[PDB]
Amino acid sequence: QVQLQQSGTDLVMPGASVKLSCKASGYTFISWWIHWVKQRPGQGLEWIGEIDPSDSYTSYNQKFKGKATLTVDKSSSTAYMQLSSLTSEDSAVYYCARSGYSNYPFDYWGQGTTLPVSS
Amino acid sequence: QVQLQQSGTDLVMPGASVKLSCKASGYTFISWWIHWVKQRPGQGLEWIGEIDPSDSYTSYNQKFKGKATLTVDKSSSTAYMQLSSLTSEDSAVYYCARSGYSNYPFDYWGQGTTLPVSS
Amino acid sequence: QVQLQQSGTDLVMPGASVKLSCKASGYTFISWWIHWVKQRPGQGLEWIGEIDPSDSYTSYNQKFKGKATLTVDKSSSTAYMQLSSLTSEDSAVYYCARSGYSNYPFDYWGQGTTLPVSS
Amino acid sequence: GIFGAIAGFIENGWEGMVDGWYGFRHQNSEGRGQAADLKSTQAAIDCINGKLNRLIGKTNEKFHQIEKEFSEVEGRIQDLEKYVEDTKIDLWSYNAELLVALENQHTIDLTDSEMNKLFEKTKKQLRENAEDMGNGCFKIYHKCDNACIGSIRNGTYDHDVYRDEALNNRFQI
């Protein structure tokens, strides 16, 4: 079946940079898009950006423009999302989701990676 | 079956205007053209004009450019001639003819509306 | 059966012009190209020219530019060759070859016409 | 294998085409008019009439056969005869249904293909003189009277004497 394996918990110091991972298995990684959703405990779901694994097409949200950078690895079928200059507002649960294309609904979601940005 | 009903005889004073009628029944009025032929007792058949009931396309004879005006009523499936300035030379039998298009033979004819222009 | 009948042997004086013949029988003459190959008694085969019987398209070898002139007769299904200004170096065996086209191979060959150019 | 002509870009059939099955229709400065195409109509009529030759008329002679209606009730032989007749009737009914469906589908595909072929032929006749309006009519960008209209319907198209006039109006206008 389609699975999106994600990291469990990463402890990162504030002001540093982290590179999350989302391993894709059970389907062809090239032909399905990968998104990234951030959910705060006190807020709703927030879409960050999307990536096309075929040719690395990037289009992010206006709020998360310099914060996140989406890259893929077609050899290992893993999609990365590099966060830069982590602050206290960036401490939330990050989900990776497979949609099908840009405007298509997210079919399968990852387990979610909690990223507590604290000292 | 297909018929083209017409009025029998109209008594019109000279110098006046008349509106002849040709009720169409038994067929789709839009798909077939309606023509108009005038037959004097001392002359042969004379073609006056043609009308396309789909979009009211008018193309008249050169002799009848300023004499006849062809209109249709798509709701009641009738075709009208607006004769203007009837004289003694306009006293003839008028036929309405269904053809199919401009360059096609007149499939079915009317009964013939005699128009005696006299006082 | 397909064959290319040629003349036997023409004894032509030097400095004169000859018109060799290659009669075509057993196939549609206008749909197959005709070539001309000269074989010296000591040297090998040398291509001269090709002709398209449909429209008399001509393209000769660079060396045999002014020497050969290829013509066809669609009525008699014969392909001619107007060799002009015969010299001592022109005394060789001449073959006619059927072909599918310019680049298609020489499917069938004639019997070969020996042309002794001597006085 | 629908070519998308009879139900595609041609929105409706022309009730008034009393002669022929496929035809043209123009709009000029000399007035409207229309006429049929004999070649495509004759090809479609030829294939349909060929189906009619292989269907209508050819019947096999079956003089002596087995009994198909029984008044008494014997077992083994009357049940094999009834089974044989029912099997033959079912097989021939299936053959008739499949034949009718296949011939009707081929007829509809053929009548779509003839319209598409005639459309593509008159499209290739006018290379840059007309544009596909997508409704079946071609916007021909030059002064064409009934002579050149019938030339397009004829096969004697020139497409070179009108090319300048049909290239200025196509681009600059």
Add this chain to the structure above:
Amino acid sequence: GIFGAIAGFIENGWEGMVDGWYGFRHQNSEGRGQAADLKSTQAAIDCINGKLNRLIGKTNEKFHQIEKEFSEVEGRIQDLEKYVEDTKIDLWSYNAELLVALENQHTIDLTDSEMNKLFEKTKKQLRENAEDMGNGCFKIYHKCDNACIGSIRNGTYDHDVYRDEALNNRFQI
């Protein structure tokens, strides 16, 4: 597959088209987007389900028949019954194989026809405002190809206010 679209100029299909069978996909200034074509998808589903209503169900009732398994040897009647049953089984197996092969070929040809019909409909909608690149895509030349003047490729493309042939359609480098 005679129209040469599904295995022809379209090099591969699109995994992720979860709503329709045929669709549009673009990359303009406002980002990538995809939509499905309901009409061609519905027509293909309609014909395939017509085949499915012909095949699924509609089973003839055969209550009493001949014996088809014999535990002893009798002779003429046994051989005749076995021959009749083998003939019926062989004829129906041939009918099933031919029907399956013909309907699969017709389904693939119908799919190719629908893909080519959608492609030609889009090409006739675009007219001279786009060029076909041979990959099944349409290089559309003006602006806002499928965001604001390209959701109207449901049948309402104006193709007149965006007659932009001077940008790159007819231009020199």
Add this chain to the structure above:
Amino acid sequence: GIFGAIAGFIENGWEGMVDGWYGFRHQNSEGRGQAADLKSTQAAIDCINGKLNRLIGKTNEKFHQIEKEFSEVEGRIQDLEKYVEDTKIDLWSYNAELLVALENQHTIDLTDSEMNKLFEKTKKQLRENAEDMGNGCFKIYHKCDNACIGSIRNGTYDHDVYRDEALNNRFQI
């Protein structure tokens, strides 16, 4: 429904292909030439050989059957055996006729489709650098050193430098 190439737009055949079925034949400044297209020829050969694989070599073993020739005259059993054999022969003759006609029609449709597919592939490759003459040829509006003729056939032809020159040659006066 046939396409319009094998006997329609492609006028009279060529007879010069001794290696392939479909191909190209050009006239450049370097002279005339002919070359075959291996892909369309191989596809047509593959489907025709598949149709031959359904038929050639595949036979069913029928060892023991009923008697089909009778020296004596008898009643119900002999009449039933003759009726069963005649029914089987007529059904298989109808099946053979329908199969032969359907496969011949599909082979003609396949060859027409392959010729039209090769023509459309060449037309999509040439873009706006060549024109449809209606004879099946392509008036290519840019000269070349036979490298373009080589690159069109295999499929490695681009617009290259020959786009502005081709447009200038197409749109003059």
Add this chain to the structure above:
Amino acid sequence: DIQMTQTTSSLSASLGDRVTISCSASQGISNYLNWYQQKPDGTVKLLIYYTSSLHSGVPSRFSGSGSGTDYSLTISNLEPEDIATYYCQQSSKLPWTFGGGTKLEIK
């Protein structure tokens, strides 16, 4: 305006014989001439359309042929129900001009 003329303005014939109504045109019409039957009670019907095709309801007795400028209508089995006046009409060039008419009579 293309002038359409008929030589026989009034043709006299008995019952059961073939009548040939000749029709002449000024210019050359390809096959666009047609025949109309004007019965003496005013009813007009179309008999032969486009010089060869039989209109629906018309019996096989009526027939027509011709090409170029000379055109003919054939009534081989003239019956008492066929007594009428016959007209021509061009469908080639606007306006559509008719003929002078040919009124038959019983000899």
Add this chain to the structure above:
Amino acid sequence: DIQMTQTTSSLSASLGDRVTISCSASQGISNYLNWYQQKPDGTVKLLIYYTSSLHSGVPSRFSGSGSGTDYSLTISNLEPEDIATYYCQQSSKLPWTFGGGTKLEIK
């Protein structure tokens, strides 16, 4: 950016009750609203892709309807396994925006 609104942030419904969750858009998204289900452990699953189209593996209890700006999700046979947070997302105009959520509770 189009703002997704869900007024019923917390809703209480017992077992066997037809609970309706409504998501309202700022303007018409043209039948492009998706429904997501976030279980309290943290697993998110798509239920209704677009509107009135069930995702694969979704039980028949979940259903969707609506057009324009008002869309609704219906759980006719609510169970303890169906108690989760429910989100709405558009797929019309970048950026893709989610709703405030709707958490179901046992009354």
Add this chain to the structure above:
Amino acid sequence: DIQMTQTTSSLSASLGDRVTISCSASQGISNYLNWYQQKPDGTVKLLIYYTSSLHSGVPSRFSGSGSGTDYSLTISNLEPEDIATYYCQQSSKLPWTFGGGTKLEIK
């Protein structure tokens, strides 16, 4: 002009031997080499066309292979009727040049 060379001008091979004739071109011809056999009485026939296809009527013992500039003609079993002069000719560029010719002899 493409110079076409055949180094083995005279080759001696007995009956039943696999004789190999090699033809080399200056530029690369793309499998457009053609093989012609000339009998001693003057008759010339085409044996192998486009280096891999048998001409009609040619016995199956004749075969060819090669690519680029080097091509070969292989006769599996020599026969007394196979004693002839063999030529190689290209089909790539104008003019269509031939080989030097390989004459076959008996040891």
